[PDB]
């Protein structure tokens, strides 16, 4: 005579198992900005939230659940134990120490590598066949780290990389040209950093190379100072940090973007961190942003951008800087 | 000739006037939740952000702008000034103090009225025809204050109210019954706070009244404790505040749902805060949530819900509770 | 070296297996409406189209494929064969004869059963675990046929039923009351046809029962003729058939709503066709619409709606009406 | 004592006036494919349908209304008199004679020009400040026609033009390259026809010019026959017509695309028909596809694509052919 029993006549029972489960490791500024964006885009049927902060974790879980009416993701779960993560199609890693005002993203390495040595083995134990998407900084070094510990194939380990950088770039060009960013094409390659390479030779609006119309555009001295657009891209992260303390909405939106190409298998081209040994005459084990076709299996192919010798100059530059650091690890 | 003049041939200038402009006043946890939710629902063609904290403001703006590629709201602007808010269809006010742990929303009244005394005349002046959506707590009292200061007809001054408490109610009912919140119907009327009323006479799943199946349901001391679901609703804000410090995701979702009915002129019914003088024997000018039909002109109608004598009793004590605080008229 | 080999560096092959694959059987007016609605809701990652008319089929496929840039379903395929339908989560059957002007849906039974006798075993063989969504008329009887032929548990054989009649009901109620269909609640149970039942005991706006306010509502010969709203529901198919020849947009929308609850495992309640033996004194194996809770496994539960003696009477005569045609067992 | 009056307490009344109204002239294959696509994308709050076929018109109106529950466009109206069209932000023209198997789209001119002389003056009388979007064939000639009769500024008269052609192109390249169409960039310029110009010099994946890697690509004799991709683009319309009788879904989706850039004012670049006198050394009053930045005011700017002398050769070719026809009109 329970209310439920007078009202509902049961046929079937509690299968469980989700088809499109997404996990978000770390429920901080970035982790919740990723979660909100991924929920609004309706990509998962089950989202799993993991943090070591128990109170915060349960608190953000509840705030998202409270919003159930308005969502189309009926199972929202969280925990400290990784069992909650089981059979995730995608695992977004956002956990770690973030930059303090004026901090070099390369200073976070000690602290974040200790976090990864801990969580990678726990996430791979429960989801042996997931696509890892690393957001934590320094993202290029940390993607290598996940790869190295997890033992996964180079296709299932992605670093958010220069998706955000190129998104800032398009936005900045778009404001100069008076065209929506969607319509200005421009790649920010290499390190998700201070040593990122603007590929000037590829910047265009509706198939027209801005470099043929303006050969002065790019890595020099004279102009309408297009070169300062690349500079505001390198600086934008710092200025936002100085103004609000951290960055979050642009990264959350750029994660939902990659998350959509993985979940729907669209095979779209995105500048993301991948293993580049055997490609720009880079002979080491580095991870850096290159245009990659992203799908349900992760990175299935890399696009061999036609780089000028100056641009290929800065890519072995960005790439060496980066490996300098990496051998000091080795664990 | 600029690179701009070489690439693009101009055909017009013109007055870029916004058609679906939304203003968010206060760029805090609640304001940005509102903002992101409204941007992902693609309700606005221009969003304006106003805050007194100049840096925070610029910061949130740039973070949002860098995500431009991923949104469909081409213009995002901000200022301390209010000239930026001109010709807004709707303005969402989230400015002010929030609860500290264990604090009643009624306790913020004096500080928030002090801020509304400044903001309302600057809003009313630049968007003579906007709809005001009041989020700041205690929401019922600030909605009356907003009304009073503004000089606006009642139809155009809306408190976010029990939209959110109703969502939380439906979620909790949902859990117990094994059905999505969307198929569980139930209303939380009165104060958006401790004195809210569960309308158990009306809780249904597919037209069937749970109070008809289980006459002991709710405001009954008997057997399966449905009454504890209302206590959880009441307590839910306090409980997320104790765990993460503030609530934000649920209300940003609830506001974008409201925002949707208003911008698209949907004529949906939402439990929101409005002037209930005349209805339910209410002789005082108090604001509280009652089911309202929401459209391009704000509140066009109020639904006369048929309250059991015990639910009417409880609604009255709720407006009695709000008027007690309301005789303070510090404006 | 191809231009392909020069542009792109490959990292993998792999088995492109679909995760959210939808099959639409029959590429007519109803099948393409279903198809477009399901593609715009971005429910599938692969859609397969099967029809016997080879040319029409190729045609609809190419039209759809040319719109690829505007959709997020990367793979669209078709064939006469059924090998193309493998590992589908859901299959929407819209194949068969439709009504000529003035024709009862019960009249198509013999022709459509002849087609189901061929299609069902070819479906059941290649997607052992799909959910069957039956659209072909008379929908109630073909759902039973589909069930019977298939060997599938009842939970996985769904008729589109009164989902659509309920939508039409809510629309009409909507008009009269001045509120969006979304805020008007009401159910059309029984046969998806002339014998359907309006459940006036349950029609509400915000929890308030219209039958409580106006006791003469509906299955009453008295004053404002709410009963004429049900007559319009019954008649609506006949009337659009006389004016444009067939109905298509409403049912494609109604099917994509259903499709949504199933793919995302929403657990929403929809009036759909299922086996009602045991409920409401129904001693025969007939299919008809009753409020059902819909999820990744199909029908997991049936809601026991509390019918007035006159509504129970009318539901019985509706299953009595369907069983009369049902003793024909030509399969 | 009406039901409505016991239930609803009125505050406000029937304002009317819509903010985002869209009109669709012609409710045939294309007109309803435009309407469905525009409704699913939620761009209008009011849609107006106009046709001379009264029965068909009312029948499609009803089928769309029946689907109200599932939509977010609460006013759906139709008529034979243009008063229904009043104060439309956008008017989509789809009315006219369509191609029979093997018919040259230039043969429809007599029949469609008689239709336009009739409807243009009626649509401009009710919406003096609308953006006209012409879809009817031959679209280039007919856009000129609307321009000429309406007396509108060249910015508010757009022809759907080569949006569809370039959408087919990307789709075809995308299948060769194994990349989503979204990611392969390629412009089909000129006549929405048989004399359309593929701009090979602008085709790229992630900023890399396929022509620098493969100089043989394009307008010649040797290869991997990329030139046949342009040919299937020219032929695709005919083959779809031969297979299903007409084309509709790809055009409907491409109209919703432009409709979104106009309604939301995104300022996106699209290949659409516009007045090109004073641009490729074309000295006449022709309309042909060029990359244009599209917004709330229509075409605000044109992008001066860098064309090879061969490509500029075929653009004055396409453009002359086209004006040959046009002087025979003059009305
Ligand atoms: N790649 C990009 O473009 C990008 C952009 C912005 C920020 N980031 C990075 O994201 C990271 C997080 O920044 P943020 O603002 O959200 O930080 P935050 O302080 O707000 O949150 C970090 C979260 O990590 C958690 N954490 C620590 N150890 C953990 C463990 N074992 N498991 C789970 N969680 C653990 C914390 O408890 C905290 O909740 C930083 O490394 C930052 O640089 C990357
Ligand atoms: N109604 C609801 O259901 C509900 C739900 C949650 C929170 N809230 C209320 O939301 C309000 C905002 O909450 P919060 O977390 O975002 O606070 P917060 O401190 O994060 O941000 C409040 C913001 O208000 C701005 N502000 C203050 N005075 C201002 C003024 N005169 N002009 C402009 N901006 C001004 C601040 O500078 C700050 O950025 C609080 O009153 C809170 O209680 C209501
Ligand atoms: N349940 C509802 O509410 C509802 C609503 C509308 C229409 N319908 C029903 O939808 C069905 C389809 O309607 P319609 O307008 O699209 O018809 P239609 O003639 O437009 O298309 C029917 C299609 O079925 C295909 N077909 C027939 N036999 C086949 C077989 N063995 N295998 C494969 N395909 C086969 C045809 O070749 C044709 O393309 C009819 O039975 C109609 O009554 C039901
Ligand atoms: N530009 C493109 O890429 C493109 C692509 C496909 C089709 N088209 C064109 O669209 C047009 C329509 O094709 P379709 O399949 O929908 O045709 P259809 O036969 O299905 O419909 C044409 C509609 O026009 C109507 N009509 C005739 N005179 C009218 C008047 N004064 N006012 C209103 N409506 C009137 C008809 O009654 C009919 O309903 C054709 O000219 C065709 O070439 C353009």
PDB file of C-alpha atoms in Angstrom, chain D residues 59-280:
ATOM      1  CA  UNK D  59      -3.783  21.841 -43.977  1.00  0.00           C
ATOM      2  CA  UNK D  60      -0.008  22.501 -43.453  1.00  0.00           C
ATOM      3  CA  UNK D  61      -0.883  25.319 -40.918  1.00  0.00           C
ATOM      4  CA  UNK D  62      -2.932  22.748 -38.892  1.00  0.00           C
ATOM      5  CA  UNK D  63      -0.195  19.954 -39.054  1.00  0.00           C
ATOM      6  CA  UNK D  64       2.444  22.544 -37.719  1.00  0.00           C
ATOM      7  CA  UNK D  65      -0.030  23.765 -35.011  1.00  0.00           C
ATOM      8  CA  UNK D  66      -0.816  20.143 -33.917  1.00  0.00           C
ATOM      9  CA  UNK D  67       2.973  20.013 -33.124  1.00  0.00           C
ATOM     10  CA  UNK D  68       2.773  23.116 -30.849  1.00  0.00           C
ATOM     11  CA  UNK D  69       3.620  21.170 -27.710  1.00  0.00           C
ATOM     12  CA  UNK D  70       7.031  20.272 -29.188  1.00  0.00           C
ATOM     13  CA  UNK D  71       7.834  23.747 -30.564  1.00  0.00           C
ATOM     14  CA  UNK D  72       8.894  27.134 -29.086  1.00  0.00           C
ATOM     15  CA  UNK D  73       7.033  29.337 -31.650  1.00  0.00           C
ATOM     16  CA  UNK D  74       3.643  30.032 -30.141  1.00  0.00           C
ATOM     17  CA  UNK D  75       1.942  31.946 -33.033  1.00  0.00           C
ATOM     18  CA  UNK D  76       1.567  30.110 -36.294  1.00  0.00           C
ATOM     19  CA  UNK D  77      -0.715  31.931 -38.790  1.00  0.00           C
ATOM     20  CA  UNK D  78      -1.563  31.684 -42.510  1.00  0.00           C
ATOM     21  CA  UNK D  79      -3.583  33.299 -45.204  1.00  0.00           C
ATOM     22  CA  UNK D  80      -4.107  34.295 -48.792  1.00  0.00           C
ATOM     23  CA  UNK D  81      -4.168  37.999 -48.008  1.00  0.00           C
ATOM     24  CA  UNK D  82      -0.793  39.570 -47.241  1.00  0.00           C
ATOM     25  CA  UNK D  83      -2.120  41.312 -44.098  1.00  0.00           C
ATOM     26  CA  UNK D  84      -0.936  38.240 -42.147  1.00  0.00           C
ATOM     27  CA  UNK D  85       2.687  39.141 -43.208  1.00  0.00           C
ATOM     28  CA  UNK D  86       2.671  42.561 -41.461  1.00  0.00           C
ATOM     29  CA  UNK D  87       5.956  43.613 -39.815  1.00  0.00           C
ATOM     30  CA  UNK D  88       8.039  40.619 -40.757  1.00  0.00           C
ATOM     31  CA  UNK D  89      11.767  40.904 -39.953  1.00  0.00           C
ATOM     32  CA  UNK D  90      12.361  38.292 -42.755  1.00  0.00           C
ATOM     33  CA  UNK D  91      10.311  37.123 -45.766  1.00  0.00           C
ATOM     34  CA  UNK D  92      11.384  33.842 -47.396  1.00  0.00           C
ATOM     35  CA  UNK D  93      10.135  33.518 -50.981  1.00  0.00           C
ATOM     36  CA  UNK D  94       9.689  29.931 -52.195  1.00  0.00           C
ATOM     37  CA  UNK D  95       6.719  30.226 -54.449  1.00  0.00           C
ATOM     38  CA  UNK D  96       6.838  29.281 -58.119  1.00  0.00           C
ATOM     39  CA  UNK D  97       7.196  26.657 -60.785  1.00  0.00           C
ATOM     40  CA  UNK D  98       9.871  24.035 -60.096  1.00  0.00           C
ATOM     41  CA  UNK D  99      11.919  21.965 -62.525  1.00  0.00           C
ATOM     42  CA  UNK D 100      10.513  18.974 -64.376  1.00  0.00           C
ATOM     43  CA  UNK D 101      13.033  16.129 -65.108  1.00  0.00           C
ATOM     44  CA  UNK D 102      15.709  17.474 -67.499  1.00  0.00           C
ATOM     45  CA  UNK D 103      14.463  21.104 -67.226  1.00  0.00           C
ATOM     46  CA  UNK D 104      16.947  23.996 -67.392  1.00  0.00           C
ATOM     47  CA  UNK D 105      16.231  26.250 -64.340  1.00  0.00           C
ATOM     48  CA  UNK D 106      16.364  29.182 -66.810  1.00  0.00           C
ATOM     49  CA  UNK D 107      13.090  27.892 -68.467  1.00  0.00           C
ATOM     50  CA  UNK D 108      11.047  28.815 -65.318  1.00  0.00           C
ATOM     51  CA  UNK D 109      11.610  32.534 -65.937  1.00  0.00           C
ATOM     52  CA  UNK D 110       8.257  33.474 -67.684  1.00  0.00           C
ATOM     53  CA  UNK D 111       6.109  31.661 -65.147  1.00  0.00           C
ATOM     54  CA  UNK D 112       8.028  32.854 -62.037  1.00  0.00           C
ATOM     55  CA  UNK D 113       8.466  36.435 -63.100  1.00  0.00           C
ATOM     56  CA  UNK D 114       4.554  36.725 -63.329  1.00  0.00           C
ATOM     57  CA  UNK D 115       4.361  35.346 -59.771  1.00  0.00           C
ATOM     58  CA  UNK D 116       6.867  37.974 -58.454  1.00  0.00           C
ATOM     59  CA  UNK D 117       5.265  40.966 -60.180  1.00  0.00           C
ATOM     60  CA  UNK D 118       2.237  39.903 -58.136  1.00  0.00           C
ATOM     61  CA  UNK D 119       3.712  39.085 -54.699  1.00  0.00           C
ATOM     62  CA  UNK D 120       6.582  41.596 -54.286  1.00  0.00           C
ATOM     63  CA  UNK D 121       4.362  44.712 -54.168  1.00  0.00           C
ATOM     64  CA  UNK D 122       2.029  42.903 -51.758  1.00  0.00           C
ATOM     65  CA  UNK D 123       4.882  41.821 -49.395  1.00  0.00           C
ATOM     66  CA  UNK D 124       6.615  45.332 -49.419  1.00  0.00           C
ATOM     67  CA  UNK D 125       3.238  47.016 -48.640  1.00  0.00           C
ATOM     68  CA  UNK D 126       3.008  45.192 -45.305  1.00  0.00           C
ATOM     69  CA  UNK D 127       6.647  44.978 -44.276  1.00  0.00           C
ATOM     70  CA  UNK D 128       8.397  48.059 -45.693  1.00  0.00           C
ATOM     71  CA  UNK D 129      11.558  47.243 -43.738  1.00  0.00           C
ATOM     72  CA  UNK D 130      11.960  43.404 -44.170  1.00  0.00           C
ATOM     73  CA  UNK D 131      14.912  41.400 -45.496  1.00  0.00           C
ATOM     74  CA  UNK D 132      13.714  39.545 -48.617  1.00  0.00           C
ATOM     75  CA  UNK D 133      15.339  36.039 -48.993  1.00  0.00           C
ATOM     76  CA  UNK D 134      14.591  34.579 -52.407  1.00  0.00           C
ATOM     77  CA  UNK D 135      14.836  30.871 -52.883  1.00  0.00           C
ATOM     78  CA  UNK D 136      12.657  30.426 -56.041  1.00  0.00           C
ATOM     79  CA  UNK D 137      14.452  29.410 -59.274  1.00  0.00           C
ATOM     80  CA  UNK D 138      16.213  30.807 -61.306  1.00  0.00           C
ATOM     81  CA  UNK D 139      17.278  32.410 -57.983  1.00  0.00           C
ATOM     82  CA  UNK D 140      19.877  34.886 -59.457  1.00  0.00           C
ATOM     83  CA  UNK D 141      17.359  36.340 -61.979  1.00  0.00           C
ATOM     84  CA  UNK D 142      14.560  36.327 -59.458  1.00  0.00           C
ATOM     85  CA  UNK D 143      16.619  38.163 -56.789  1.00  0.00           C
ATOM     86  CA  UNK D 144      17.246  40.928 -59.401  1.00  0.00           C
ATOM     87  CA  UNK D 145      13.524  40.850 -60.121  1.00  0.00           C
ATOM     88  CA  UNK D 146      12.616  41.330 -56.439  1.00  0.00           C
ATOM     89  CA  UNK D 147      15.123  44.149 -56.118  1.00  0.00           C
ATOM     90  CA  UNK D 148      13.844  45.876 -59.256  1.00  0.00           C
ATOM     91  CA  UNK D 149      10.060  45.754 -58.252  1.00  0.00           C
ATOM     92  CA  UNK D 150      10.389  46.230 -54.495  1.00  0.00           C
ATOM     93  CA  UNK D 151      12.553  49.433 -54.792  1.00  0.00           C
ATOM     94  CA  UNK D 152      14.569  48.195 -51.781  1.00  0.00           C
ATOM     95  CA  UNK D 153      18.216  48.947 -51.030  1.00  0.00           C
ATOM     96  CA  UNK D 154      20.579  46.202 -52.372  1.00  0.00           C
ATOM     97  CA  UNK D 155      21.284  45.050 -48.784  1.00  0.00           C
ATOM     98  CA  UNK D 156      17.697  43.892 -47.984  1.00  0.00           C
ATOM     99  CA  UNK D 157      17.285  41.719 -51.105  1.00  0.00           C
ATOM    100  CA  UNK D 158      19.143  38.389 -50.909  1.00  0.00           C
ATOM    101  CA  UNK D 159      18.973  35.332 -53.060  1.00  0.00           C
ATOM    102  CA  UNK D 160      19.726  31.966 -51.383  1.00  0.00           C
ATOM    103  CA  UNK D 161      22.336  31.644 -54.168  1.00  0.00           C
ATOM    104  CA  UNK D 162      25.340  29.370 -53.796  1.00  0.00           C
ATOM    105  CA  UNK D 163      24.859  28.526 -50.089  1.00  0.00           C
ATOM    106  CA  UNK D 164      23.467  25.130 -51.137  1.00  0.00           C
ATOM    107  CA  UNK D 165      26.055  24.622 -53.879  1.00  0.00           C
ATOM    108  CA  UNK D 166      28.981  25.216 -51.474  1.00  0.00           C
ATOM    109  CA  UNK D 167      27.259  23.000 -48.881  1.00  0.00           C
ATOM    110  CA  UNK D 168      27.174  20.146 -51.496  1.00  0.00           C
ATOM    111  CA  UNK D 169      30.861  20.840 -52.360  1.00  0.00           C
ATOM    112  CA  UNK D 170      32.120  20.579 -48.735  1.00  0.00           C
ATOM    113  CA  UNK D 171      30.072  17.472 -48.279  1.00  0.00           C
ATOM    114  CA  UNK D 172      31.757  15.905 -51.422  1.00  0.00           C
ATOM    115  CA  UNK D 173      35.325  16.949 -50.432  1.00  0.00           C
ATOM    116  CA  UNK D 174      34.665  15.868 -46.854  1.00  0.00           C
ATOM    117  CA  UNK D 175      33.893  12.344 -48.172  1.00  0.00           C
ATOM    118  CA  UNK D 176      37.121  12.248 -50.199  1.00  0.00           C
ATOM    119  CA  UNK D 177      39.256  13.548 -47.310  1.00  0.00           C
ATOM    120  CA  UNK D 178      37.501  11.712 -44.397  1.00  0.00           C
ATOM    121  CA  UNK D 179      36.910  15.017 -42.646  1.00  0.00           C
ATOM    122  CA  UNK D 180      33.493  16.518 -41.583  1.00  0.00           C
ATOM    123  CA  UNK D 181      32.294  19.110 -44.205  1.00  0.00           C
ATOM    124  CA  UNK D 182      32.360  21.799 -41.450  1.00  0.00           C
ATOM    125  CA  UNK D 183      36.128  21.415 -41.548  1.00  0.00           C
ATOM    126  CA  UNK D 184      36.777  21.453 -45.407  1.00  0.00           C
ATOM    127  CA  UNK D 185      36.463  24.988 -46.786  1.00  0.00           C
ATOM    128  CA  UNK D 186      35.537  25.520 -50.455  1.00  0.00           C
ATOM    129  CA  UNK D 187      33.518  28.241 -52.299  1.00  0.00           C
ATOM    130  CA  UNK D 188      31.133  27.608 -55.224  1.00  0.00           C
ATOM    131  CA  UNK D 189      30.703  31.112 -56.720  1.00  0.00           C
ATOM    132  CA  UNK D 190      28.513  32.635 -59.444  1.00  0.00           C
ATOM    133  CA  UNK D 191      25.209  31.349 -60.807  1.00  0.00           C
ATOM    134  CA  UNK D 192      23.160  28.902 -58.673  1.00  0.00           C
ATOM    135  CA  UNK D 193      23.578  26.794 -61.720  1.00  0.00           C
ATOM    136  CA  UNK D 194      25.446  24.925 -64.488  1.00  0.00           C
ATOM    137  CA  UNK D 195      27.919  27.751 -64.882  1.00  0.00           C
ATOM    138  CA  UNK D 196      28.936  27.906 -61.187  1.00  0.00           C
ATOM    139  CA  UNK D 197      32.646  28.545 -60.540  1.00  0.00           C
ATOM    140  CA  UNK D 198      34.529  26.295 -58.103  1.00  0.00           C
ATOM    141  CA  UNK D 199      37.269  28.596 -56.480  1.00  0.00           C
ATOM    142  CA  UNK D 200      40.060  26.013 -56.267  1.00  0.00           C
ATOM    143  CA  UNK D 201      42.590  28.521 -55.026  1.00  0.00           C
ATOM    144  CA  UNK D 202      40.644  28.833 -51.822  1.00  0.00           C
ATOM    145  CA  UNK D 203      39.932  25.160 -50.968  1.00  0.00           C
ATOM    146  CA  UNK D 204      41.630  24.169 -47.724  1.00  0.00           C
ATOM    147  CA  UNK D 205      41.647  21.997 -44.702  1.00  0.00           C
ATOM    148  CA  UNK D 206      42.968  23.741 -41.525  1.00  0.00           C
ATOM    149  CA  UNK D 207      44.571  26.697 -43.388  1.00  0.00           C
ATOM    150  CA  UNK D 208      46.350  24.539 -46.019  1.00  0.00           C
ATOM    151  CA  UNK D 209      45.609  25.349 -49.627  1.00  0.00           C
ATOM    152  CA  UNK D 210      44.964  22.027 -51.429  1.00  0.00           C
ATOM    153  CA  UNK D 211      46.167  23.786 -54.667  1.00  0.00           C
ATOM    154  CA  UNK D 212      49.781  24.328 -53.286  1.00  0.00           C
ATOM    155  CA  UNK D 213      50.045  20.584 -52.470  1.00  0.00           C
ATOM    156  CA  UNK D 214      48.324  19.548 -55.704  1.00  0.00           C
ATOM    157  CA  UNK D 215      48.751  22.169 -58.445  1.00  0.00           C
ATOM    158  CA  UNK D 216      46.938  19.886 -60.869  1.00  0.00           C
ATOM    159  CA  UNK D 217      43.703  20.295 -58.782  1.00  0.00           C
ATOM    160  CA  UNK D 218      40.980  22.104 -60.782  1.00  0.00           C
ATOM    161  CA  UNK D 219      40.106  23.260 -64.361  1.00  0.00           C
ATOM    162  CA  UNK D 220      42.046  20.969 -66.709  1.00  0.00           C
ATOM    163  CA  UNK D 221      42.794  17.399 -67.627  1.00  0.00           C
ATOM    164  CA  UNK D 222      45.149  15.382 -65.296  1.00  0.00           C
ATOM    165  CA  UNK D 223      44.659  13.787 -61.799  1.00  0.00           C
ATOM    166  CA  UNK D 224      42.652  12.100 -59.120  1.00  0.00           C
ATOM    167  CA  UNK D 225      39.858  13.964 -60.960  1.00  0.00           C
ATOM    168  CA  UNK D 226      38.963  16.633 -58.400  1.00  0.00           C
ATOM    169  CA  UNK D 227      37.215  18.412 -61.258  1.00  0.00           C
ATOM    170  CA  UNK D 228      34.398  15.764 -61.175  1.00  0.00           C
ATOM    171  CA  UNK D 229      33.530  16.936 -57.618  1.00  0.00           C
ATOM    172  CA  UNK D 230      32.525  20.358 -59.106  1.00  0.00           C
ATOM    173  CA  UNK D 231      30.669  18.396 -61.820  1.00  0.00           C
ATOM    174  CA  UNK D 232      28.741  16.309 -59.274  1.00  0.00           C
ATOM    175  CA  UNK D 233      27.886  19.641 -57.548  1.00  0.00           C
ATOM    176  CA  UNK D 234      26.331  20.953 -60.887  1.00  0.00           C
ATOM    177  CA  UNK D 235      24.636  17.596 -61.462  1.00  0.00           C
ATOM    178  CA  UNK D 236      23.435  16.845 -57.909  1.00  0.00           C
ATOM    179  CA  UNK D 237      20.256  18.857 -58.282  1.00  0.00           C
ATOM    180  CA  UNK D 238      19.271  16.952 -61.428  1.00  0.00           C
ATOM    181  CA  UNK D 239      20.014  13.532 -59.996  1.00  0.00           C
ATOM    182  CA  UNK D 240      17.975  14.178 -56.867  1.00  0.00           C
ATOM    183  CA  UNK D 241      15.068  15.354 -59.046  1.00  0.00           C
ATOM    184  CA  UNK D 242      15.303  12.224 -61.227  1.00  0.00           C
ATOM    185  CA  UNK D 243      15.377  10.077 -58.035  1.00  0.00           C
ATOM    186  CA  UNK D 244      12.629  11.673 -55.789  1.00  0.00           C
ATOM    187  CA  UNK D 245      11.109  14.302 -58.085  1.00  0.00           C
ATOM    188  CA  UNK D 246      12.400  17.430 -56.386  1.00  0.00           C
ATOM    189  CA  UNK D 247      14.892  18.670 -53.786  1.00  0.00           C
ATOM    190  CA  UNK D 248      13.977  20.012 -50.328  1.00  0.00           C
ATOM    191  CA  UNK D 249      15.828  19.078 -47.184  1.00  0.00           C
ATOM    192  CA  UNK D 250      19.233  20.456 -48.129  1.00  0.00           C
ATOM    193  CA  UNK D 251      17.635  23.772 -49.286  1.00  0.00           C
ATOM    194  CA  UNK D 252      15.446  24.008 -46.122  1.00  0.00           C
ATOM    195  CA  UNK D 253      18.550  23.562 -43.874  1.00  0.00           C
ATOM    196  CA  UNK D 254      20.618  26.005 -45.916  1.00  0.00           C
ATOM    197  CA  UNK D 255      17.711  28.605 -45.569  1.00  0.00           C
ATOM    198  CA  UNK D 256      17.610  28.160 -41.748  1.00  0.00           C
ATOM    199  CA  UNK D 257      21.407  28.851 -41.785  1.00  0.00           C
ATOM    200  CA  UNK D 258      21.076  32.186 -43.502  1.00  0.00           C
ATOM    201  CA  UNK D 259      17.940  32.888 -41.498  1.00  0.00           C
ATOM    202  CA  UNK D 260      20.008  32.419 -38.262  1.00  0.00           C
ATOM    203  CA  UNK D 261      22.744  34.855 -39.427  1.00  0.00           C
ATOM    204  CA  UNK D 262      20.086  37.443 -40.291  1.00  0.00           C
ATOM    205  CA  UNK D 263      17.897  37.037 -37.120  1.00  0.00           C
ATOM    206  CA  UNK D 264      20.779  36.884 -34.588  1.00  0.00           C
ATOM    207  CA  UNK D 265      22.911  39.362 -36.604  1.00  0.00           C
ATOM    208  CA  UNK D 266      26.016  37.143 -36.367  1.00  0.00           C
ATOM    209  CA  UNK D 267      27.749  38.792 -39.388  1.00  0.00           C
ATOM    210  CA  UNK D 268      28.805  35.423 -40.875  1.00  0.00           C
ATOM    211  CA  UNK D 269      30.316  35.039 -44.434  1.00  0.00           C
ATOM    212  CA  UNK D 270      28.022  33.153 -46.867  1.00  0.00           C
ATOM    213  CA  UNK D 271      28.119  32.722 -50.676  1.00  0.00           C
ATOM    214  CA  UNK D 272      24.703  34.418 -51.518  1.00  0.00           C
ATOM    215  CA  UNK D 273      23.276  36.365 -54.534  1.00  0.00           C
ATOM    216  CA  UNK D 274      23.861  40.014 -54.391  1.00  0.00           C
ATOM    217  CA  UNK D 275      24.314  42.895 -56.782  1.00  0.00           C
ATOM    218  CA  UNK D 276      27.806  42.707 -58.174  1.00  0.00           C
ATOM    219  CA  UNK D 277      28.041  45.855 -60.395  1.00  0.00           C
ATOM    220  CA  UNK D 278      31.443  47.486 -59.856  1.00  0.00           C
ATOM    221  CA  UNK D 279      33.238  44.416 -58.640  1.00  0.00           C
ATOM    222  CA  UNK D 280      34.852  41.778 -60.904  1.00  0.00           C
TER     223      UNK D 280
END
